[PDB]
Design a protein around this ligand. Structure first.
Ligand SMILES: CCCCCCCCCCCCCCCCCC(=O)OC[C@H](COP(=O)([O-])OCC(O)COP(=O)([O-])OC[C@@H](COC(=O)CCCCCCCCCCCCCCCCC)OC(=O)CCCCCCCCCCCCCCCCC)OC(=O)CCCCCCCCCCCCCCCCC
Ligand SMILES: CCCCCCCCCCCCCCCCCC(=O)OC[C@H](COP(=O)([O-])OCC(O)COP(=O)([O-])OC[C@@H](COC(=O)CCCCCCCCCCCCCCCCC)OC(=O)CCCCCCCCCCCCCCCCC)OC(=O)CCCCCCCCCCCCCCCCC
Ligand SMILES: CCCCCCCCCCCCCCCCCC(=O)OC[C@H](COP(=O)([O-])OCC(O)COP(=O)([O-])OC[C@@H](COC(=O)CCCCCCCCCCCCCCCCC)OC(=O)CCCCCCCCCCCCCCCCC)OC(=O)CCCCCCCCCCCCCCCCC
Ligand SMILES: COC1=C(OC)C(=O)C(C/C=C(\C)CC/C=C(/C)CC/C=C(\C)CC/C=C(/C)CC/C=C(\C)CC/C=C(\C)CC/C=C(\C)CC/C=C(\C)CC/C=C(/C)CCC=C(C)C)=C(C)C1=O
Ligand SMILES: CCCCCCCCCCCCCCCCCC(=O)OC[C@H](COP(=O)([O-])OCC[N+](C)(C)C)OC(=O)CCCCCCCCCCCCCCCCC
Ligand SMILES: CCCCCCCCCCCCCCCCCC(=O)OC[C@H](COP(=O)([O-])OCC[N+](C)(C)C)OC(=O)CCCCCCCCCCCCCCCCC
Ligand SMILES: CCCCCCCCCCCCCCCCCC(=O)OC[C@H](COP(=O)(O)OCCN)OC(=O)CCCCCCCCCCCCCCCCC
Ligand SMILES: CCCCCCCCCCCCCCCCCC(=O)OC[C@H](COP(=O)(O)OCCN)OC(=O)CCCCCCCCCCCCCCCCC
Ligand SMILES: CCCCCCCCCCCCCCCCCC(=O)OC[C@H](COP(=O)(O)OCCN)OC(=O)CCCCCCCCCCCCCCCCC
Lengths: 186, 98, 96, 587, 62, 54, 108, 97, 52, 70
């Protein structure tokens, strides 16, 4: 579950909805979905305050969770239009608000946790990339021409265009040997 | 040392935790519950309703499951679990599962 | 687009041909014709892509000669500034 | 040797440290993990040894040095400034503390980040920050001081936001960046005013001719403002931003996501002390200032109270340490307002050493808890981190200012010299008293909740750290190097603090000259105290005793030992009464 | 101009490996020339300028 | 630690690698931008040394 | 919100030479990102006088009257400089037109 | 320039030296720090030689050698600065021209 | 520029952990209402020390 | 964190160990020390110091502070 409660410009109503239910819009959830989500949120908060707390009392925690379980079992069997169910929703949303902590412990496995996204993972596209051929062999042809295509050189990584004319070794013998040979022949 | 050659990522079996270990721990935790009648009938193909796990006991068990596996599960993921196999695969494929 | 020639005349391109062997035999009735050239680049085996592979002394020699010329030119300028043919060295020097 | 006394080697060793750091940053491919570690360790050890040799000469004897590297920049028509360093008592007091804490943090930083992919980057960033701070405190003129001021802000922006792949840490770093830009503006405007007045940037000269401009005024568009008042206002503003006083403190708690060695350096001396250094660097100016006289004690006491009380309520270990640092910065501001410059140095050294050690212990605990810094998910860690438990106990009893510890004396000295002539004295004194008693609360909470509570953490930590196959002579939940670093840091801290106490608090005054001519009668109540003062300090002593009784004997939960706890409290009260009677009247 | 032209035309023959191969194939006097003489030209220009800015012909020495 | 693996056994421990510059080590182009910029640096340094210091 | 269907894109002059650095590999763009890229340039006001109240009227008025405030503050500080005989805000003429470091030589 | 300090008598300084006090006097630079002495340039030559040899060894072994190169240029580049600033007539706290 | 843009986890430029206070005015009201306790405790401490 | 592959073409510094780090450390440390020694030797020319214990500054000596004749 993404823990973006405070890193988005949310109002309290949106944050309260996200804390009580796994969505900003609880009106699109079924009755059973709403009851189960509220029960899970309440149990999570009670555990975060009465088991992982400051001076934790296990006996009191057991009493409170037993009472909450009884109440939510009553809640599940009610009808959505009943006012008693609405009162129960209001009571447990108030309980969630009253135990709200600006310093919530966020599990490190959640998407927007404190230590999430600390490392950039390289995919296979970057791993197999080698323009120059030191790590992976590079053809002098620079590519394999597929059929139905002309054979064209790959675009270089550096398109400088700051080049001279072709360089030749000094005293390079470049006479028209073929033409001279044929003209001598006839 | 890295071989100084192009090496791609290795997916291996796709499980970051032992599936058998995850399944055994999860089934033991399920059997720890009061409304579960017999541990010997639980199977990876068993549905939560078969072993007698109503939605409230389901959320109770899945909270202790995320406590026991050092992870935390979203509401939608838990809602998509139909059998023990689905939860076992989801937990075993989690990168943070310990 | 680039239009320069790649078959240079100054030197031969370092390459090997054992990699990427051609088939040349045992063809079926459906597969494509084999490729022609298959040669690949060969690196000097002492090349480090992560640093300059510079083993010369020209840059260091040029900078050292420039610095030495600067020193001797300053000595000449100071001697000329004091109206002397060479620097008169005092027997004791103190902190500025 | 007389050659060493006449020509310091501190410059050579510091240059070696700086150049090794820079070249390791540039040539990081040639040096692996081990190469960078070894090279920078050698350089930092040589620097520390040289500065340790010169520490005694500068502190006890009247040795100081003015080094010029050469003419640097033209700042006016026909005017040039040089790169000047002033190695005197004020500079060495900060530089030695920074270097010692940095050496031990450097050794600890390899064990921390043990298998992280970017240990070299963190090591080099810590070295850069330490170098910048040492250059800042050794300034000879105002331009070098501004350079150090801008360097510490820049290098701390990179220790923060070390996890550069996250924009969440980028926001936290940018907060401090904006506050540092404001600090730079204030400091540079103050320097401009100083240069427009006296036409010099040398600090020493400024400290000796500013009294000639006390009766001067400057013309703002509709105001005639005293020169000393406006200069002191700007200096105090930038110092307040750097030292994280009330209001301008909000950047500091958000700076806690940096790695814990960076937090150990930043929050113990260095950055938070920088503002204090400024007050110590320009003492005559603030001695002749009405704005300082009114604003230092009030803001200092408010900051002390605020930080002390907020710290006692924190659950994150790093947040607790950060708010304790804020409270101690306020206490340092009040101690400077006292008018005794020795007490400021003693407070600085004690707090810096023990706060750095506490950060190191907390960092090991946090690493064990797998990056969960809230002790609501800890408990029963004594058997898994025993060295951390015991060293942390020592460091917290010293840091909290408990009776019969080294940290008690700085609080006592602060309360000896407090001036009672302020108009807002009741608020200042109440804030100071409430902030003094807050150390016991957060020290006890941190220690007890981390080490000696019920198991509130996840089962995975405890059960994976206790498998049978792991039983060996090599078994440990930390590194041996971390334990050695913390042990030697504590030993060196004790030695240095005892030496300073002997130098300043003995009957024979041995400290070198502080170059200040404002002398008050504060030492009299230290040398020849009277009865009412002793009774007044006894009042606070008994308040602390009551608070200790409260934190020890209060039961906030049901337990099998509740009745026996009440019985033990009654037994302790009766035994204390009878023991007092026997020790006072009969035998 | 001579120094910069010779420098450019001697160090602009290809990539690092190609340049290394060409230099290795070069005979010793050719390598000596392509190293030394651009430096000689540029340094002689600088020396002429320095002699231009210094008055060392003044006869009131001693 | 309990199950530490040394650098030789660790297959994901890297040695220095990577191209320093985007320029092709086996480029066959008579490129002169690099030479021009080195000329700029070297001539500026030489002009500083031979004209300005002393 | 549905992705935009019509928005301002990038455009190039006819017969433009494409940029082919690093192998010349161009990816498909994000409609929302391109929309943001070109939104501000093409934004315009809808009716006369809409600017004054757009945002904060007091803040907009203060921004509008900034140059007058600067001029008035400069005038006040010029009053301060006049009685203290400080540098006034005038084009000082003390070099008689001789430039800063200018060669003044003759021929013949 | 002037004296800028109140006057003192010769009898008083005679009494001071009888009491065991000594008049402060600037000290000459030692041979190692003197940029005009012979030991200075012997050290410079030793530095240049060892730098050249270690540069050759670093090239052979594959270590960086640009830092050994900076020592070679550093010697004549720092001789200019050390001797150049001694020629200037500006007065620091050290001694009076 | 009111958002820290990112291809992974974009964020708002300012974080608000104390969002249970909806706005700054109710925040100021709550802060003063709760700081009255600290004011009272400081007054008691000063009264003790002024008497004795 | 668990190790993950880094592309070969990137000149980045994640999990890098140089096997020849001892010689590189030597050849980066000692010339650095020599350069710093030269800098310190140059800087000691412009270093000041107060008079030692048992010494006093004669106010009429040339080294004593001076005023300006107008
Ligand atoms: C690439 C990509 C870059 C991307 C950049 C993006 C921006 C962000 C930054 C990214 C950084 C990382 C990327 C690069 C990483 C990398 O490649 O690292 C490996 C790379 C090494 O590559 P390599 O594979 O080893 O190849 C090197 C060769 O093998 C060596 O072979 P060699 O033995 O022949 O050595 C040749 C060397 C031999 O010469 C030298 O080594 C001495 C150079 C002297 C320079 C000054 C000469 C005089 C002119 C200037 C005015 C002086 C006035 C007076 C001053 C007093 O000469 C040169 O290299 C010429 C360079 C200078 C040309 C002149 C114009 C510039 C002058 C200023 C130079 C400043 C350099 C950087 C300084 C940085 C710190 C401040 O760099 C390093 O490892 C370290 C580099 C810096 C070394 C500095 C050494 C100290 C020099 C001190 C000289 C002065 C002494 C003064 C003494 C006291 C006097 C009082
Ligand atoms: C009769 C005599 C008359 C004359 C008398 C004397 C008069 C002297 C007057 C003064 C003369 C001064 C020099 C004048 C210019 C001509 C010098 C010249 O041509 O020398 C080269 C020439 C031969 O050079 P070469 O061997 O062909 O190699 C050069 C190749 O073109 C290129 O080689 P490569 O591409 O194969 O290898 C690359 C290598 C080659 O080295 C070079 O190309 C050196 C120049 C590099 C320039 C850029 C370096 C970086 C500058 C940074 C500046 C500071 C930035 C930050 C500031 C804050 O580059 C490096 O190693 C790069 C250096 C490392 C850089 C690392 C930077 C890291 C980041 C730093 C900043 C971080 C913070 C930001 O020298 C000689 O032939 C010497 C002849 C000696 C004759 C003796 C008698 C027989
Ligand atoms: C000469 C060299 C001396 C060196 C001394 C080194 C330290 C010795 C003590 C080691 C244990 C320290 C535990 C610290 C943590 C703690 O208190 O956890 C709560 C922890 C709660 O666990 P628990 O056992 O479940 O508590 C339930 C019942 O309260 C359990 O009740 P109980 O029946 O177990 O306890 C009854 C009895 C059990 O008797 C013993 O345990 C005997 C052994 C310890 C005797 C210590 C001296 C007692 C007389 C003073 O203890 C008492 O009657 C203690 C009364 C005296 C302390 C309160 C008033 C002190 C006013 C004057 C303070 C002046 C010194 C300030 C600090 C100086 C620097 C450290 O309570 C205790 O550990 C209480 C026993 C220890 C009391 C003495 C502590 C001395 C240190 C100063 C007070 C603590 C300040 C905050 C420090 C936070 C860490 C930096
Ligand atoms: C507990 O803090 C607080 C914080 O944390 C420091 C906070 O973050 C915040 C939150 C703040 C914000 C969100 C922004 C607001 C910005 C601010 C700058 C507000 C900061 C508020 C404070 C620092 C609190 C200070 C205010 C009060 C009212 C403190 C109350 C102190 C007392 C009651 C002490 C008792 C004093 C007495 C009894 C004086 C009586 C006099 C005598 C008995 C005679 C003897 C005295 C003399 C001879 C000299 C003294 C005479 C006078 C006239 C001076 C007295 C004046 C005083 C103010 C004492 C708040 C509200 C806060 O509240
Ligand atoms: C004239 C005197 C006026 C005195 C005014 C009242 C002063 C009270 C003491 C100072 C303020 C303390 C505020 C709380 C700080 C700690 C908060 C915290 O985290 O608590 C949890 C800590 C540790 O517990 P915990 O964190 O493990 O969990 C406990 C459970 N919760 C979280 C719900 C609290 O517990 C305590 O602090 C216990 C309560 C302390 C009560 C102190 C009563 C003092 C009584 C007055 C004595 C006066 C003596 C004479 C003085 C003469 C000189 C003035
Ligand atoms: C003349 C005298 C000049 C004196 C000042 C000289 C200043 C030099 C600064 C350093 C230049 C090189 C920086 C390289 C950083 C780097 O590689 O980072 C790797 C990482 C990236 O690692 P990477 O793995 O992606 O890349 C490594 C490979 N390279 C670099 C070749 C591509 O960069 C960062 O994290 C970016 C931020 C770097 C911030 C560096 C800290 C501040 C440095 C301050 C230096 C001065 C401090 C002391 C004060 C001195 C005052 C005189
Ligand atoms: C703008 C406001 C200008 C106000 C008038 C000029 C400054 C004051 C001149 C009179 C001298 C004086 O009173 O100086 C002391 C004062 C600091 O003391 P203060 O804070 O007033 O003490 C409270 C007393 N119960 O000193 C000051 O207040 C000096 C403040 C200087 C900096 C002002 C802000 C920057 C410049 C604009
Ligand atoms: C005069 C100008 C003074 C500027 C410094 C003083 C004001 C500081 C304001 C701090 C602020 O608003 O910070 C918000 C944000 C970081 O805040 P936060 O989300 O808490 O980051 C921690 C991440 N976990 O940080 C930022 O947004 C940084 C940019 C703040 C720009 C402030 C502009 C002037 C406001 C008055
Ligand atoms: C405080 C506690 C510090 C504990 C440090 C423990 C690690 C350590 O430094 O060990 C000494 C080290 C051992 O090196 P070793 O393990 O043999 O290297 C394996 C790589 N081949 O050996 C060394 O560090 C020395 C090896 C040579 C180092 C470089 C020498 C040239 C540069 C010297 C600069 C001074």
């Amino acid at each position: 579950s993404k823990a973006y409660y405070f890193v988005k410009n949310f109002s309290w109503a949106e944050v309260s909805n996200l804390l009580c239910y796994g969505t900003k819009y609880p009106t699109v959830l079924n009755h059973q979905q709403k009851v189960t989500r509220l029960y899970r949120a309440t149990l999570r908060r009670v555990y975060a305050h009465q088991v992982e707390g400051y001076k934790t009392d296990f006996k009191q925690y057991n009493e409170n969770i037993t009472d909450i379980g009884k109440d939510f079992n009553k809640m599940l069997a009610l009808k959505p239009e009943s006012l008693e169910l609405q009162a129960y929703f209001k009571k447990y949303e108030d309980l969630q608000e009253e135990l709200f902590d600006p310093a919530m412990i966020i599990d490190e496995s959640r998407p927007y946790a404190a230590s999430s996204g600390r490392y950039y993972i390289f995919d296979d596209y970057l791993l197999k990339f080698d323009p120059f051929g030191f790590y992976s062999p590079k053809l002098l042809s620079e590519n394999r021409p597929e059929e139905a295509m002309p054979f064209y050189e790959d675009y270089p990584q550096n398109d400088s265009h700051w080049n001279l004319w072709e360089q030749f070794p000094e005293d390079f013998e470049d006479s028209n040997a073929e033409r001279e040979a044929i003209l001598k022949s006839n | 040392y890295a071989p100084q050659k192009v090496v791609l990522r290795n997916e291996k079996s796709g499980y970051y935790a032992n599936p058998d270990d995850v399944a055994r721990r999860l089934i033991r935790l399920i059997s720890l519950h009061d409304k579960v009648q017999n541990p010997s009938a639980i199977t990876l193909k068993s549905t939560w309703s078969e072993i007698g796990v109503d939605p409230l006991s389901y959320v109770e068990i899945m909270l202790e499951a995320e406590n026991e596996f050092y992870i935390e599960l979203a509401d939608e993921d838990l809602e998509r679990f139909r059998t023990v196999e689905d939860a076992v695969e989801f937990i075993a494929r989690n990168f943070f599962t310990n | 687009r680039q239009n320069f020639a790649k078959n240079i005349t100054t030197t031969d391109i370092p390459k090997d041909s054992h990699h990427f062997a051609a088939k040349r035999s045992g063809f079926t009735q459906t597969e494509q014709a084999p490729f022609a050239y298959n040669d690949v680049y060969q690196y000097p085996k002492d090349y480090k892509p992560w640093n300059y592979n510079y083993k010369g002394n020209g840059v260091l020699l040029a900078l050292f000669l420039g610095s030495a010329f600067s020193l001797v030119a300053y000595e000449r300028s100071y001697a000329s500034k004091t109206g002397r043919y060479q620097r008169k060295v005092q027997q004791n020097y103190y902190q500025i | 040797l007389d050659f060493l006394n006449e020509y310091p080697i501190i410059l050579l060793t510091g240059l070696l440290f700086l150049f090794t750091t820079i070249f390791s940053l540039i040539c990081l491919s040639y040096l692996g993990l081990y190469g960078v570690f070894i090279l920078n360790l050698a350089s930092i050890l040589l620097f520390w040894l040289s500065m340790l040799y010169y520490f005694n000469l500068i502190v006890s004897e009247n040795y100081y040095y003015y080094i010029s590297l050469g003419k640097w920049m033209y700042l006016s028509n026909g005017f040039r400034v040089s790169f000047d360093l002033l190695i005197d008592l004020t500079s060495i007091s900060f530089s030695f503390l920074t270097l010692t804490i940095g050496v031990f943090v450097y050794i600890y930083t390899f064990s921390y980040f043990r298998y992280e992919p970017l240990v070299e980057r963190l090591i080099l960033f810590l070295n850069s920050f330490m170098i910048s701070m040492i250059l800042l405190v050794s300034s000879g003129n105002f331009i070098v001081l501004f350079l150090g001021w801008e360097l510490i802000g820049l290098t701390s922006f990179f220790l923060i936001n070390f996890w550069s792949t996250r924009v969440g840490t980028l926001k936290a770093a940018f907060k401090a960046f904006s506050f540092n830009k404001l600090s730079d503006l204030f400091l540079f405007f103050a320097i401009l005013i100083i240069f427009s007045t006296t036409y010099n940037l040398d600090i020493l000269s400024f400290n000796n001719q500013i009294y000639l401009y006390e009766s001067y005024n400057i013309d703002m568009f509709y105001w005639s403002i005293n020169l000393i008042e406006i200069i002191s206002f700007f200096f105090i503003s930038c110092a307040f931003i750097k030292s994280a006083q009330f209001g301008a403190h909000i950047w500091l708690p958000d700076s806690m996501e940096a790695p814990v060695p960076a937090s150990a350096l930043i929050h113990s001396a260095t950055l938070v002390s920088a503002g204090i250094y400024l007050l110590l660097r320009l003492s005559p100016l603030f001695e002749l200032s009405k704005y300082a006289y009114f604003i230092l004690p009030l803001i200092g006491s408010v900051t002390a109270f605020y930080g002390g009380l907020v710290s006692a309520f924190q659950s994150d270990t790093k947040k607790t340490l950060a708010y304790s640092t804020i409270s101690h910065c306020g206490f340092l501001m009040v101690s400077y307002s006292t008018g005794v410059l020795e007490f400021v140095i003693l407070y600085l050294y004690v707090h810096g050493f023990f706060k750095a050690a506490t950060f190191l212990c907390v960092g090991n605990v946090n690493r064990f808890n797998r990056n969960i810094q809230d002790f609501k998910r800890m408990g029963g860690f004594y058997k898994y981190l025993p060295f951390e438990c015991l060293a942390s106990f020592v460091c917290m009893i010293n840091l909290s200012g408990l009776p019969l510890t080294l940290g008690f004396y700085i609080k006592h000295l602060l309360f000896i010299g407090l001036v009672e002539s302020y108009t807002l004295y009741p608020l200042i004194f109440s804030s100071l008293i409430l902030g003094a008693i807050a150390g016991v609360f957060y020290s006890y909470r941190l220690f007890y909740s981390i080490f000696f509570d019920t198991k509130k953490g996840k089962k995975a930590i405890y059960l994976q750290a206790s498998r049978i196959i792991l039983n060996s002579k090599f078994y440990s939940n930390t590194s041996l190097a971390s334990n050695l670093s913390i042990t030697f840091l504590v030993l060196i801290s004790y030695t240095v603090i005892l030496y300073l106490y002997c130098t300043t608090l003995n009957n024979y005054y041995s400290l070198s000259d502080l170059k200040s001519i404002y002398i008050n009668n504060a030492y009299s109540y230290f040398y020849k105290p009277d009865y009412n003062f002793l009774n007044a300090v006894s009042i606070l002593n008994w308040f602390v005793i009551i608070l200790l009784i409260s934190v020890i004997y209060l039961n906030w939960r049901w337990s099998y030992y509740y009745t026996k706890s009440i019985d033990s409290l009654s037994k302790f009260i009766l035994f204390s009464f009878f023991f007092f009677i026997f020790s006072k009247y009969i035998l | 101009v001579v120094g910069v032209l010779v420098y450019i035309f001697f160090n602009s023959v290809g990539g690092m490996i190609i340049r290394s191969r060409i230099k290795a194939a070069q005979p010793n006097p050719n390598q000596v020339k392509v190293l030394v003489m651009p430096f000689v030209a540029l340094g002689v220009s600088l020396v002429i300028s320095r002699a231009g800015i210094n008055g060392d012909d003044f006869g009131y020495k001693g | 630690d309990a199950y530490y693996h040394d650098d030789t056994h660790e297959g994901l421990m890297n040695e220095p690698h990577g191209y320093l510059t985007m320029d092709d080590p086996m480029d066959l182009r008579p490129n002169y931008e690099k030479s021009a910029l080195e000329l700029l640096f070297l001539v500026s340094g030489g002009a500083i040394l031979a004209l300005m210091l002393g | 919100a549905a992705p935009p269907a019509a928005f301002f894109l990038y455009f190039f002059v006819p017969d433009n030479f494409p940029s082919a650095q690093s192998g010349f590999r161009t990816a498909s763009r994000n409609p929302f990102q391109v929309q943001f890229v070109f939104a501000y340039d093409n934004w315009e006001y809808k009716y006369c006088g809409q600017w004054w109240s757009m945002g904060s009227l007091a803040v907009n008025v203060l921004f509008f009257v900034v140059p007058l405030f600067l001029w008035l503050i400069l005038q006040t500080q010029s009053d301060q400089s006049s009685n203290r005989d400080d540098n006034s805000l005038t084009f000082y003429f003390s070099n008689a037109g001789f430039f800063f470091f200018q060669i003044y030589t003759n021929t013949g | 320039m002037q004296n800028a300090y109140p006057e003192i008598t010769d009898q008083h300084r005679e009494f001071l030296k009888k009491q065991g006090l000594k008049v402060y006097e600037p000290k000459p630079l030692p041979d190692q720090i003197n940029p005009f002495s012979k030991t200075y340039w012997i050290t410079n030559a030793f530095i240049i030689g060892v730098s050249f040899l270690a540069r050759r060894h670093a090239l052979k072994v594959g270590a960086p050698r640009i830092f050994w190169s900076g020592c070679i240029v550093g010697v004549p580049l720092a001789a200019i600065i050390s001797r150049g600033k001694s020629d200037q007539l500006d007065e620091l706290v050290g001694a009076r021209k | 520029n009111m958002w820290m843009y990112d291809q992974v986890y974009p964020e708002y430029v300012i974080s608000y952990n104390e969002i249970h206070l909806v706005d700054q005015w109710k925040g100021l009201k709550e802060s003063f209402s709760q700081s009255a306790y600290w004011w009272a405790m400081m007054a008691m401490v000063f009264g003790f020390y002024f008497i004795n | 964190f668990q190790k993950y592959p880094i592309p070969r073409y990137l000149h980045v510094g994640q999990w890098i160990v140089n096997k020849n780090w001892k010689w590189n450390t030597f050849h980066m440390f000692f010339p650095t020390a020599i350069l710093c020694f030269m800098v310190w030797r140059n800087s000691m020319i412009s270093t000041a110091k107060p008079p030692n214990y048992g010494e006093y500054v004669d106010p009429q000596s040339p080294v004593a502070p001076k005023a300006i004749k107008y």
